[PDB]
Design an enzyme around this catalytic site. Structure first.
Site, short mmCIF file in Angstrom:
data_model
loop_
_atom_site.label_atom_id
_atom_site.label_comp_id
_atom_site.label_asym_id
_atom_site.label_seq_id
_atom_site.Cartn_x
_atom_site.Cartn_y
_atom_site.Cartn_z
N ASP A 181 30.85 44.21 40.85
CA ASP A 181 30.26 42.92 40.44
C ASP A 181 30.70 42.51 39.03
OD1 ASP A 181 28.80 42.44 42.85
OD2 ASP A 181 26.86 42.39 41.85
N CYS A 215 39.40 34.62 46.52
CA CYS A 215 38.19 35.29 46.01
C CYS A 215 37.13 34.20 45.89
CB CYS A 215 38.49 36.05 44.71
SG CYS A 215 39.51 35.12 43.45
N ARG A 221 40.83 37.80 40.76
CA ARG A 221 41.25 38.85 41.69
C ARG A 221 42.46 38.41 42.53
NH1 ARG A 221 35.07 40.24 43.80
NH2 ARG A 221 34.20 40.30 41.67
N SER A 222 42.46 37.16 42.99
CA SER A 222 43.57 36.65 43.80
C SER A 222 44.88 36.71 43.02
CB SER A 222 43.29 35.21 44.25
OG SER A 222 42.18 35.12 45.16
N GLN A 262 41.97 36.05 34.93
CA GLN A 262 40.89 35.34 34.23
C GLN A 262 40.41 36.02 32.96
OE1 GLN A 262 38.31 34.98 37.89
NE2 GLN A 262 37.79 33.02 36.96
#
Ligand SMILES: CCNC(=O)Nc1cc(C)on1
EC number: 3.1.3.48
Length: 282
Positions: A181, A215, A221-222, A262
């Site tokens: 998370d 994502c 994440r992508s 990010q």
């Protein structure tokens, strides 16, 4: 510089945030005018994450062709990816329309439907064989065929039917279920194992349309997934693998979608994944 020793040099000097801010400063800025039209407000999950006009995927529809999705075309590596946000309640039919029209074999999902107690994307595939889904706005039917649950990821076989023509196709759903998370994984081993399983399926190969990867926003994440894949492929293709520059590859990918990677922690994790992966390939 090479990668593994540039890596230790940034660790010892604690300058990941400065490296990452340089990337943000140099990244391309292209218009995203279609994304910002008022009629498309409920088609975007986040107001600050939009596809560029020049690389956006168009739906084959005359009313409204807009989806929050981008084509990332890597010329030297000879790989393409579609990066998209997690589908919204009012865009699940558009999502599967895109999969159909672009001839994709695989969908890569890097998030859980609920994270941090909030919904990160719609439940856009069926959870039971006998309870199929019908998308009336785009005239598609989607059926769960089989499901294989492993410790770090789940693979599903799905059947997509175009109800207008009665054509059917098999789609593979690759779901990485263990990204934490908060932060990034401590070791890249399970993420790399997952990448290799996607590769082994044929879903990344030129005989199919581009893989669809998402994502929640489709950039973090992508971005890590396609950056690691492309860097490892270039290391196999070139005479000098130490010439592969992960920062330059990332800036090339940011010509096609804003915001890829990010955080500085995601940048460090991408370096780690490519470094460890390059040892296993040989
Ligand atoms: C170095 C020559 N051998 C390979 O590159 N093997 C592999 C395996 C995978 C996977 O990618 N390359």
């Amino acid at each position: 510089m090479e990668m593994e020793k540039e890596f230790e040099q940034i660790d010892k000097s604690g300058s990941w945030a400065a490296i990452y801010q340089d990337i943000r400063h140099e990244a391309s800025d292209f218009p995203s005018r279609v994304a910002k039209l008022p009629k498309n407000k409920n088609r975007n999950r986040y107001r600050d994450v939009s596809p560029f006009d020049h690389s956006r995927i168009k739906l084959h529809q005359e009313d409204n062709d807009y989806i929050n999705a981008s084509l990332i075309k890597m010329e030297e590596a000879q790989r393409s990816y579609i990066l998209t946000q997690g589908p919204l309640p009012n865009t699940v039919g558009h999502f599967w329309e895109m999969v159909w029209e672009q001839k994709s074999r695989g969908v890569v999902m890097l998030n859980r439907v609920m994270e941090k107690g909030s919904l990160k994307c719609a439940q856009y595939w069926p959870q039971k064989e006998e309870k199929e889904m019908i998308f009336e706005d785009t005239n598609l039917k989607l059926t769960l065929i089989s499901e294989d649950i492993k410790s770090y990821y789940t693979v599903r076989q799905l059947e997509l039917e175009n109800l207008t023509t009665q054509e059917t196709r098999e789609i593979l759903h690759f779901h990485y279920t263990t990204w934490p998370d908060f932060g990034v994984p401590e070791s890249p081993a399970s993420f790399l194992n997952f990448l290799f399983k996607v590769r082994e399926s044929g879903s990344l190969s030129p005989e199919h349309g581009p893989v669809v990867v998402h994502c929640s926003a489709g950039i973090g994440r992508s971005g890590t997934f396609c950056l690691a894949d492309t860097c490892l492929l270039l290391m196999d293709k070139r005479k000098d693998p130490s010439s592969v520059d992960i920062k330059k590859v990332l800036l090339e990918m940011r010509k096609f979608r804003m915001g890829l990677i990010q955080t500085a922690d995601q940048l460090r994790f991408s370096y780690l994944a490519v470094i460890e992966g390059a040892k296993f390939i040989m």
